[PDB]
Amino acid sequence: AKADYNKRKPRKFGKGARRCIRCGQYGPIIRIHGLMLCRHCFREVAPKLGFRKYE
């Protein structure tokens, strides 16, 4: 089989086990309360989610 030379391994931990659900980046993922978003993407969609900057 030649298709087996393109599939990735199913990792369950490490930096490679989590991707942003909006841009697909690895790395700075916010894992709080089940969010899966980069620190970059969270800033520009936070008002739509109901967050506010009170202080």
Partner 1 sequence: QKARIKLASTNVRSLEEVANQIKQIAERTGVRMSGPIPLPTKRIRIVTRKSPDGEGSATFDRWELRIHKRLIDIEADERAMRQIMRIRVPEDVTIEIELI
Partner 2 sequence: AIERYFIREAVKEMLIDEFLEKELRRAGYGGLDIKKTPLGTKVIIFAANPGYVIGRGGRRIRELTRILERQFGLENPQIDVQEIKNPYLNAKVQAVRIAQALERGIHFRRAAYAAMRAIMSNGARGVEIRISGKLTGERAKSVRFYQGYLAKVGNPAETLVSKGYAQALLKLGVIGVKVAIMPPDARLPDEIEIIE
Partner RNA sequence: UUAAUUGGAUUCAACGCCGGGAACCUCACCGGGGGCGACGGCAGGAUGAAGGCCAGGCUGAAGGUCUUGCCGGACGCGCCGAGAGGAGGUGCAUGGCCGCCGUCAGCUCGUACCGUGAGGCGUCCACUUAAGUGUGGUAACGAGCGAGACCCGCGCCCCCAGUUGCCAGUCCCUCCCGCUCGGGAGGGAGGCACUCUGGGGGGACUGCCGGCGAUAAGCCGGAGGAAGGGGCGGGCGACGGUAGGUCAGUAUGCCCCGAAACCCCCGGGCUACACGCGCGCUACAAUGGGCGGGACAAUGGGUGCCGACCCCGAAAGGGGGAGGUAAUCCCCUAAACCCGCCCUCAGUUCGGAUCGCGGGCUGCAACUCGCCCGCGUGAAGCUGGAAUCCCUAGUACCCGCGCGUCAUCAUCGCGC
Of the candidate residues 23, 30, 35, 45, the single one contacting Zn ion (CB under 5 A): 23
With CB under 5 to 8 Å by kind, the binding choice for 1 among partner 2, RNA, partner 1, none is RNA
x-marked contacts with Zn ion along 35-54 as a string, rule CB under 5 A: ---x--x-------------
**The residue to which tokens 């989590």 are assigned:** 18
Q: Is the dihedral of CA 30, 11, 22, 26 positive or negative?
A: positive
- The DSSP call for residue 23 is T
- The answer to whether residue 24 forms part of the interface with partner 2 (CB under 8 A) is no
